[PDB]
């Protein structure tokens with residue numbers, strides 16, 4: 257399994273305790289980091305994934321997980337962690353852009369409030385299957401499957417902040433962070449054996465008055481397994497439902513105060529996922545992973 | 551009064567019968583243009599503004615009005631008309647872009663479905679007050695009031711088609727057609743002595759399930775005059791309402807089958823304009839001009 261389903265590894269809870277597996281420095285313990293803000297005293301109760309360990313975390317909503325190295329005359333107290341297993345489904349990686357010809361050869365925009373979703377959405381409208389974000393404000397679309405052409409980069413090189421949301425990475429100069437344009441669409445058809453479906457506008461907070469239906473139709477499936485590796489909802493009014501495709505009967509309903517079980521199975525090959533959002537509130541959103549069985 | 555409230559002078563009904571007032575050629579009569587498609591036989595009943603005259607018209611939904619010149623070995627049967635009075639409120643003109651520094655110095659996009667409204671909307675989101683369209687696909691934002699810096703051009707130089715809608719002009723290479731970003735917004739506050747308010751997404755067809763309120767609040771006005779120099783609605787379900795700001799009482803309601811009077815007055819300084827749109831249909835839209843009185 258991948259270990260983060262957020263854009264910035266907010267949700268990373270794994271056990272990496274080096275800034276990098278290769279060439280890295282080791283993390284300080286969050287229960288000894290009292291010279292800094294971020295430690296188990298400020299965050300008892302396990303807030304932020306912090307606790308009696310030295311694992312990489314991101315409790316300051318930065319653009320990626322990190323930890324405190326301990327300064328070596330460098331002047332550098334902390335570093336971002338480069339965690340290859342922490343890469344949200346739909347994030348295709350960080351690649352080098354050497355200019356002409358660029359990696360994605362569709363159509364572009366630049367934006368003072370650019371975010372990942374904003375880039376994805378522009379690209380999606382345009383009928384392109386990939387979106388690419390650079391230098392915090394630039395956005396590129398394209399159907400090129402050879403975006404990887406000029407070589408992959410370490411994800412820490414794609415850490416320039418999104419101009420629109422300082423909690424999201426938007427690539428780096430010469431560096432472009434690539435996303436599948438399906439991520440966060442309001443509805444869809446799905447047929448794959450398994451895939452992930454995120455809230456509308458993920459990783460941005462889901463817009464107001466959203467109403468989305470996603471059909472998951474897997475002919476030949478005897479039953480389908482659902483799990484929620486992410487689930488943030490603020491309001492009881494905001495809802496996620498599962499509907500029998502044939503009957504439209506409501507199999508399950510999950511809201512701010514109803515919390516999705518570990519997993520559940522549905523005895524159907526045809527299910528609809530339904531999401532209704534309150535105007536008044538928006539929250540982090542969710543991610544649901546479905547696995548079909550033959 | 552300005553003589554067109556559309557982007558392409560579809561609605562021009564004035565009496566210009568030269569391709570241009572200065573240096574131009576004269577128009578053929580639409581009731582003699584039988585060697586061409588466009589004539590009073592194909593269009594009896596005055597369709598398209600065509601009839602027993604030689605006035606500039608645009609019945610083929612091209613990007614601007616035109617007429618048939620009559621060929622002079624040129625090989626050229628028709629030309630666009632350059633009509634200075636036919637310039638929809640909000641269209642700020644056609645200007646020269648000489649590259650660095652460009653006329654609008656905000657932020658830009660390029661788009662395979664670019665239209666005027668699309669450009670306006672991008673710019674509007676970004677908090678810029680002007681949008682500029684070039685070469686049919688390019689879109690530029692900015693707050694520069696000196697966009698006119700490199701000189702104005704004849705509107706016929708901004709006639710490259712919008713990639714997204716072949717009925718709209720999207721500038722020309724080296725040429726940029728400028729719009730106020732208020733045009734077609736879904737709602738607003740208005741205070742001016744008078745101004746024009748267009749359908750949502752004008753000049754594109756109004757999106758589905760639109761619900762818009764515009765407040766027109768002119769303190770000191772004894773009463774306010776309303777007229778509709780444009781009104782296309784396909785469905786009875788699609789509606790425009792006027793509401794007493796103080797009471798929210800419905801002063802007037804206009805829909806596909808209810809047709810706005812010449813003018814009407816309201817004995818108030820505070821009125822709300824309300825627009826509800828059916829999912830099923832979208833139409834050309836409307837333009838309403840209000841004049842406050844002291």
Ligand SMILES: *[C@@H]1O[C@H](CO)[C@@H](O)[C@H](O)[C@H]1NC(C)=O
Pocket residue numbers: 285287288308309
């Ligand atoms: C913090 O917890 C770590 C890991 O369990 C432990 O090794 C260390 O001694 C603890 N230090 C304090 C001050 O609790």
Ligand SMILES: *[C@@H]1O[C@H](CO)[C@@H](O)[C@H](O)[C@H]1NC(C)=O
Pocket residue numbers: 271272273282309310
């Ligand atoms: C990383 O994880 C655990 C403690 O949480 C421990 O076994 C291991 O020694 C840690 N690595 C380092 C370098 O401290």
Ligand SMILES: *[C@@H]1O[C@H](CO)[C@@H](O)[C@H](O)[C@H]1NC(C)=O
Pocket residue numbers: 579581582602603
């Ligand atoms: C067409 O109408 C014009 C303008 O009224 C007139 O001058 C002309 O003789 C008419 N021609 C025909 C064929 O009706």
Ligand SMILES: *[C@@H]1O[C@H](CO)[C@@H](O)[C@H](O)[C@H]1NC(C)=O
Pocket residue numbers: 565566567576603604
């Ligand atoms: C333009 O308009 C009217 C006829 O519709 C006429 O008075 C005038 O002569 C026309 N001009 C030309 C050049 O035909």
Ligand SMILES: [Cl-]
Pocket residue numbers: 292293
């Ligand atoms: Cl710090």
Ligand SMILES: [Cl-]
Pocket residue numbers: 297298
């Ligand atoms: Cl504290």
Ligand SMILES: [Cl-]
Pocket residue numbers: 352430
């Ligand atoms: Cl490099």
Ligand SMILES: [Cl-]
Pocket residue numbers: 378672
């Ligand atoms: Cl956009």
Ligand SMILES: [Cl-]
Pocket residue numbers: 469
């Ligand atoms: Cl449905």
Ligand SMILES: [Cl-]
Pocket residue numbers: 586587
């Ligand atoms: Cl023709």
Ligand SMILES: [Cl-]
Pocket residue numbers: 591592
């Ligand atoms: Cl015919």
Ligand SMILES: [Cl-]
Pocket residue numbers: 646724
């Ligand atoms: Cl020039």
Ligand SMILES: [Cl-]
Pocket residue numbers: 763
């Ligand atoms: Cl209201």
